[PDB]
């Protein structure tokens, strides 16, 4: 007799609803597994990598249930530029009787804290063990800047390989090596095509996968069959996420910082402009804790060119009006998660792909912007992502002076020009300004086959500073 919405509301109320975060909790006592932190904010960012026409948004919605938009009326089916966003709350069943593999379950953002166990015969609830944010990375040969920026943001990885297609996929190796660049070993390999794969052919494909990942830094990466259309084998993914991936070191003494990947203009059309909202910076906090109503500034900010050819950088000052997590308004920010900081920044400033991978620092801290950067780069022997028909896969050339190369400094995608080349170090001149705070591991890509190709990793060791104009 009762409607299904009434049933869901009753379960939500019995499940504890969504407890509201305290206005000023004791910050030094909070951990990424605390109830006030875990109930409304994710703590681990898990990225998805895979070839095009393989299925990652389908896998994401199978795991989390939050769909990726796949927008712009022309990027709906082919590729996506901006990373996808998804949210899954990991739950475990307390009862010892039910088997461990199906104890875990990833539930949507609006799921209750203690929802009922959907398994027939088990009257138990669910315990929220971890909150994770699932982000889709673009696996396309030209789509590397966004992919590398996401990999920088990511704390865990999921590689997707199609069993029925060719066993060695060079774009998968590209993404795996890019993840190896940025010091991330928590990778869970997943086979997308298990429904349409034979008994011995699947074993051969798994053996080939094990053969491929032998010399790479990642060694004990778990490998798990999953389904994207039948939407099975999700609980094992939750178990492996909980076990193989521990909490990255991220606590409260570090200075507050933000790395914005995407920007949104909050202005609903049709309704009169009298009721509008400011500008949203979609950023991950790799370090620091934020609250409601803080004072921040985007260090690279506005880029302008004078009549004399000088690059002026304006730090975009902004008061944080609010911070939005996946579900509702929060009062404090847990480090290591993607958050939409809705500030007084112009919605016009957050209109296009403008605030794509830019660093933001709170007032009382001075990240340093640079024009010429003294970098230390390491290359690989062979280019990854090239499909050669059985003859000596592409060989990496040493970088030449006065060559335009795409450098992803943690989040900033800049076209650097080589000033000089040394045995292991180089000088890069940037027309687009970029910052440096502590390390900001750098991904290097070269234009060889008409598109950006990853060549190796690099680290900033020095830079020619520029003093921003207030």
């Amino acid at each position: 007799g009762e409607t299904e919405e009434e049933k869901r509301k009753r379960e939500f109320e019995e499940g504890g609803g969504l407890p509201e975060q305290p206005l000023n909790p004791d910050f030094s006592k909070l951990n990424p597994l605390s109830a006030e932190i875990i109930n409304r904010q994710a703590t681990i960012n898990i990225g998805t990598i895979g070839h095009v026409a393989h299925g990652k948004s389908t896998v994401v919605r199978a795991i989390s249930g939050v769909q990726t938009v796949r927008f712009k009326d022309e990027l709906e089916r082919n590729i996506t530029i901006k990373l996808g966003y998804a949210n899954a709350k990991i739950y475990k069943c307390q009862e010892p009787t039910c088997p461990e593999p199906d104890c875990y379950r990833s539930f949507k953002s609006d799921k209750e804290i203690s929802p009922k166990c959907q398994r027939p015969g088990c009257p138990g609830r669910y315990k929220l063990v971890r909150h994770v944010s699932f982000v889709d990375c673009p696996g396309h040969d030209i789509l590397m800047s966004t992919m590398l920026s996401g990999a920088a943001v990511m704390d865990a990885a999921l590689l997707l390989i199609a069993g029925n297609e060719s066993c060695p996929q060079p774009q998968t190796s590209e993404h795996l090596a890019a993840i190896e660049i940025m010091k991330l070993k928590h990778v869970i390999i997943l086979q997308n095509k298990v429904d349409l794969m034979r008994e011995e052919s699947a074993l051969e494909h798994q053996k080939s996968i094990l053969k491929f990942i032998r010399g790479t830094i990642a060694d004990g990466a778990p490998i798990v069959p999953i389904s994207a259309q039948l939407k099975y084998n999700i609980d094992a993914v939750n178990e492996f996420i909980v076990k193989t991936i521990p909490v990255p070191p991220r606590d409260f003494m570090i200075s507050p910082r933000l790395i914005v990947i995407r920007s949104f203009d909050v202005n609903k059309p049709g309704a009169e402009i009298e009721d509008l909202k400011g500008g949203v910076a979609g950023g991950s906090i790799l370090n620091g804790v934020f609250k409601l109503g803080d004072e921040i500034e985007i260090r690279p900010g506005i880029v302008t060119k004078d009549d004399k050819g000088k690059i002026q950088c304006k730090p975009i000052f902004s008061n944080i009006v609010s911070l939005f997590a996946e579900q509702n308004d929060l009062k404090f920010a847990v480090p290591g998660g993607l958050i939409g900081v809705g500030t007084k920044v112009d919605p016009t400033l957050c209109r296009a792909d403008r605030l794509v991978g830019q660093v933001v620092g709170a007032k009382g801290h001075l990240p340093n912007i640079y024009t010429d950067i003294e970098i230390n780069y390491f290359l690989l022997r062979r280019l990854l992502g090239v499909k050669t028909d059985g003859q000596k896969q592409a060989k990496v050339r040493k970088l030449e002076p006065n060559e335009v190369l795409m450098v992803n400094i943690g989040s900033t995608a800049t076209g650097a020009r080589v000033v000089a080349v040394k045995a292991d170090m180089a000088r890069l001149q940037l027309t687009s300004p970029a910052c440096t705070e502590i390390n900001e591991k750098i991904a290097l890509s070269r234009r060889i086959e008409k598109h950006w190709r990853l060549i190796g990793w690099a680290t900033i060791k020095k830079g020619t500073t520029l003093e921003p104009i207030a």
């Binding site: 429904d195 798994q206 094990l210 490998i223 069959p225 099975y232 492996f240």
Partner: peptide, 23 residues
């Protein structure tokens, strides 16, 4: 180690065989 892979793949195959006799 690929030990957790084999059991999960076998469970997947059993589920497909039972639910979809046409395959």
């Amino acid at each position: 180690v690929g030990l957790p892979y084999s059991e999960l793949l076998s469970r997947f195959f059993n589920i497909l065989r039972t639910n979809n006799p046409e395959l």
